[PDB]
Design a protein around this ligand. Structure first.
Ligand SMILES: *[C@@H]1O[C@H](CO)[C@@H](O)[C@H](O)[C@H]1NC(C)=O
Ligand SMILES: [NH3+]Cc1cc(-c2ccccc2)no1
Length: 350
């Protein structure tokens, strides 16, 4: 079990002004630290944030959080469940800012909600430095779904934070799971009039509502009013300096949802073209794992050890990545299926 700590800086808050926090399991022997960002979509105006507060309140508030959590998948401390990093220091950071971890805005007389995701990450890192992170050799910032996109938005800022604080020896790296989306043509169309709003338009509105922040080099490329581009992995990844491993199902359920897909020729060609386009964007990503499955998230699932690409599991590929950061015979790090239909890989989740 990981133990809850609410942030000592009470000005860094969840949506409703309650303190943000983190769950921690220390490993005294180890100089490896895993900081995991939870996911779960977002909200981008008063009306759809109010709805999220009624029936998804744990994603908006710490008032009802439990005192402990069990570590699962890559956050497990049992080598049988976690062949990769079972002896690491483990941190789970709950997602309570509804801003894809991009926001820097406080609740105030003009703001019903606070959107502080970017500041929550920075404050967790601080307070951890007084609990043993100051002795680390590797900090892996990982996350799933909205948390995976959050890795891409925040990994270089964590690296810059630690450099300016006087810790040049800690190696910061990223692991982005199910956060690599395409701003592609939808299978059926609707103008943005919540349910009808495409992610490009929803994120453009959200950035303005959240006071959202994107990595500096990407911001400089796309400039004012076009920062939404940096929420799409294939556009922001080439601007990053930190090593980032990309995990992405070729037919992600969240991607199909935003494409208005729920089989005849038209839809067959649409689905096959989606897999080809995703594979094309990963062509020159040297650390990646992309199976031809219809699913969503993987790295904190207990059975994450079961899926393989070309005979190599995800825990193995991540271990091969570690070795490469010290090509390797029989220990690959770029693993992308070429078969073109969901579940053409027999190891896909059921
Ligand atoms: C608390 O967090 C706020 C928001 O990031 C920051 O401006 C302030 O400096 C922090 N205070 C301390 C004492 O760390
Ligand atoms: N939790 C799923 C999720 C997906 C997204 C998302 C992020 C960027 C672009 C399109 C969708 N945000 O959250």
């Amino acid at each position: 079990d990981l133990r809850l700590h609410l942030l000592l800086n009470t000005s860094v808050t969840c949506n409703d002004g309650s303190p943000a926090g983190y769950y921690l399991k220390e490993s005294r022997g180890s100089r490896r630290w895993l900081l995991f960002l939870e996911g779960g979509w977002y909200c981008f105006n008063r009306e759809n944030c109010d709805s999220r507060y009624d029936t998804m309140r744990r994603l908006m508030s710490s008032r009802d959080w439990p005192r402990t959590r069990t570590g699962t998948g890559i956050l497990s401390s049992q080598p049988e469940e976690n062949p990769y990093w079972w002896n690491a220091n483990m941190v789970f950071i709950p997602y309570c800012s509804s801003d894809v971890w991009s926001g820097a805005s406080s609740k105030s007389e003009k703001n019903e909600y606070a959107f502080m995701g970017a500041l929550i990450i920075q404050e967790v890192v601080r307070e951890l430095l007084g609990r043993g992170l100051s002795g680390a050799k590797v900090l892996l910032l990982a996350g799933s779904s909205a948390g995976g996109t959050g890795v891409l938005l925040n990994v270089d800022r964590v690296a810059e934070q630690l450099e300016k604080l006087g810790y040049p020896a800690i190696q910061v790296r990223g692991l982005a799971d199910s956060g690599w989306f395409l701003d592609n043509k939808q299978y059926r169309h609707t103008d943005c009039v919540t349910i009808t709003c495409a992610p490009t338009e929803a994120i453009r509105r959200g950035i303005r509502y959240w006071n959202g922040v994107v990595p500096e080099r990407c911001r400089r490329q796309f400039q004012e009013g076009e920062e939404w581009n940096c929420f799409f992995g294939y556009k922001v990844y080439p601007t990053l300096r930190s090593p980032v491993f990309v995990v992405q199902w070729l037919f992600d359920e969240a991607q199909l949802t935003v494409d208005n897909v729920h089989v005849q020729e038209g839809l067959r060609l649409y689905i096959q073209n989606l897999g080809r386009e995703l594979r094309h964007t990963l062509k020159d990503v040297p650390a990646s794992f992309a199976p031809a499955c219809l699913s969503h998230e993987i790295i904190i699932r207990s059975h994450w050890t079961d899926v393989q690409v070309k005979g190599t599991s995800l825990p193995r590929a991540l271990h091969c990545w570690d070795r490469s950061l010290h090509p390797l015979k029989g220990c690959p790090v770029h693993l992308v299926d070429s078969c073109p239909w969901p579940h053409c890989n027999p190891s896909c989740p059921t």
